[PDB]
Amino acid sequence: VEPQVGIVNGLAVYGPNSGSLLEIEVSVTAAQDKGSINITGIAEEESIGSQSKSIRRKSMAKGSVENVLTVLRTMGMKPSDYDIHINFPGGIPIDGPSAGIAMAAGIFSAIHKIPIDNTVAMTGEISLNGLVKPIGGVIPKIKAAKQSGAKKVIIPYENQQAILKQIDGIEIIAVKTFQEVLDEILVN
Amino acid sequence: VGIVNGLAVYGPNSGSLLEIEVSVTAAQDKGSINITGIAEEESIGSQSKSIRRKSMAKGSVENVLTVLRTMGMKPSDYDIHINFPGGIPIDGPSAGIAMAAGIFSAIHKIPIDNTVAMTGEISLNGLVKPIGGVIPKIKAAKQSGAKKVIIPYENQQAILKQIDGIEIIAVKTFQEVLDEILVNPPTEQKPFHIEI
Ligand SMILES: CC(C)C[C@H](NC(=O)[C@H](Cc1ccccc1)NC(=O)c1cnccn1)B(O)O
Ligand SMILES: CC(C)C[C@H](NC(=O)[C@H](Cc1ccccc1)NC(=O)c1cnccn1)B(O)O
Ligand code: NA
Ligand code: NA
């Protein structure tokens, strides 16, 4: 209907050739106390195991949020000033590092009250130095964005391939940096 | 945000170079250590008896902080975030000297030679302890375009002398790692110079 504050279109893949678009929602309020970060709708922990051994870690999605908050501090924001809540609606259990640029964009937008273009979808792992790192399932993700009525899709520079140029009816933007993501999507 | 070139082995003979990211900022509150990209806990055994422990990676981070403390740094003055990039859980004690160098470099600003990769467990006294997969690690350092690789002294063996096209530096201490990888910082608009 409109560009909007703290709503960003992310992308997911389930197995080789099955992509989808998720409408990630970000709320930022002046902190009650020390500031906080909460996420609804993500894996909190992953376990990988064999017969006799297994490891457990905080999820790549939760790790991704911590990278995002470190990047926003290097850019001169103070996330400790805010209680921040990110919501992946629907109740679907999602994981992975590839929503890093989308959550970062969502928080930036919510903090600055600058709406994000609703015609854009994006996928991109974020590094602590603001670089956009390659992701999985970029073709099914682009087709999901198109299939959903997105005019544009932001992908990491290193996911660029010749075959992408053969896709019609959606603008594919390759980015190296989170600043380039903000340039592409923020409205005024 | 500084980069240190760490090394990993996956199966008997495959190595990779990891660009480990280290962010160190003035503490927002009581200071903090956060690591992304690692195993945090390991369970070993069966139904009948199993143990659970902090991962080797997490233990390695605790040893790093103790060493920096014994060297007169106060890691609790900082919020420290180390990111091991991508989407594989990494584990092991062998990134001890990489994480310690990355934090050192970030605290003092004295930046890290980007042509150097390294592997080594760190002890509390700051000795560099032997690691596994030293040969595939060296080969992966070479393939990534590293000109130098730091290894533990006790990993030195005759056959490494057969490896061409990379300088292999054996170290006994963390101070030696820092002697070898730290570059003279820039000199412009400084009241004095720091030389290594
Ligand atoms: C937080 C989410 C949206 C990030 C994206 N996740 C996914 O695409 C993941 C697949 C993935 C890819 C790489 C690493 C781990 C898991 N997909 C899902 O979680 C998923 C998709 N559809 C239904 C239910 N779950 B990304 O890493 O590709
Ligand atoms: C923190 C990491 C980088 C330290 C290094 N780890 C690895 O090489 C470990 C194997 C290992 C070796 C010794 C003890 C435990 C596990 N490798 C990995 O975790 C690994 C390697 N390639 C891709 C993804 N993960 B080291 O202990 O050799
Ligand atoms: Na994504
Ligand atoms: Na290593």
Numbering used by the authors:
A (entry chain B): 348 to 535
B (entry chain A): 352 to 547
Could you share sentences copied from the article?
ATP-dependent Lon proteases are key participants in the quality control system that supports the homeostasis of the cellular proteome. All Lons are single-chain, multidomain proteins containing an ATPase and protease domains, with different additional elements present in each subfamily. Primary structures of more than 100 Lon proteases from various organisms became available by the year 2000. Their comparative analysis showed that Lon proteases are non-classical serine peptidases, with catalytic centers formed by serine–lysine dyads. We thus postulate that this enzyme is the founding member of a newly identified LonBA subfamily, so far found only in the gene sequences of firmicutes.
The crystal structure of the P domain of BsLonBA (residues 347–552) was determined at the resolution of 1.9 Å. Crystals belong to the hexagonal space group P63 with two molecules (designated A and B) in the asymmetric unit, arranged around the crystallographic 3-fold axis. This arrangement results in the creation of an expected planar hexamer. The insertion of 14 residues (392–405) in the P domain of BsLonBA creates a 12-stranded β-barrel in the core of the hexameric assembly formed by β-hairpin inserts of the neighboring subunits (a detailed description below). Six inserts arranged around the three-fold symmetry axis complete a 12-stranded antiparallel β-barrel, where each insert forms nine hydrogen bonds with the neighboring subunit. Within the active site, bortezomib creates β-sheet-like interactions with residues of β1 (A359, V360, Y361) on one side, and residues of the loop β6-α3 (I441, D442) on the other side. Oxygen atoms of the boronate moiety make additional hydrogen bonds with the side-chain amine of Lys488 and the main chain nitrogen of Ser445. Analysis of the vicinity of the active site identified a putative sodium cation coordinated by carbonyl oxygens of Ser445 and Leu358, Oγ atoms of Thr470 and Ser445, and a water molecule.
